[PDB]
């Protein structure tokens, strides 16, 4: 769960849930 009320698509820093991960190929905020 990110933060502005919506439920799916951008993000990627401090994640909880393996299904949300993608293979190492980017910076981000974490």
């Amino acid at each position, epitope marked *: *769960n990110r933060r502005p009320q919506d439920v799916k698509f951008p993000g990627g820093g*401090q*994640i*909880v*849930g*393996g299904v949300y991960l993608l293979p190492r190929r980017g910076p981000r905020l974490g």
Partner: antibody
Amino acid sequence: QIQLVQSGPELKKPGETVKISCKASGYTFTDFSMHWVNQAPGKGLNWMGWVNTETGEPTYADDFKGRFAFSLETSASTAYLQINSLKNEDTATYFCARFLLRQYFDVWGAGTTVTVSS
Amino acid sequence: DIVMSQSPSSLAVSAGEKVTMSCKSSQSLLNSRTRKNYLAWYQQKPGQSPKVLIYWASTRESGVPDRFTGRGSGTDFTLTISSVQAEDQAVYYCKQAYIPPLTFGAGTKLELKR
């Protein structure tokens, strides 16, 4: 060493509110999601939720929605677990574990055991 | 919510013998993309906090005997402590983290015989 130091044992009466803490020492309190797990006396563990230690944004599990409150004092590498309107069922001990992007808990705290009673 | 079921409950084996525990999940825990299974094994001794043993359902955490082994994939995983000793007496938990909320099995107690 990387370690988490929680508050002391707490004894509150039914209905009373309580705030236990989890001091983060040994790493950067803002790089990992801090979670809170509970263990009813004699029972297994249960994931309550977690606080984003970079956004503050707290995510809660359903079984623990309403009455429970995650937060933090970033400036002090500390996270706080609050429980309002306490019930006898809420008796148990609460842990706080550092979570990785590898999806597991590499470090917990001795856990704070709160006991509700009159 | 992914429902975790551990087997057996308790389990008594003599020192030296290799024991085996099972952990099934409500649904797949395999991220087709990362190609990793999000199941970890925790060991928790009496009064202590839990202690992570294995993650990615197979990968053994740092500072752990090759005695503890985690096999499995999808929904069928199992922990196998080869050559069991008294220092292993505890309750073992498998937690799934593939999709929130995170969940634990009911725990499998490992006692020792003598």
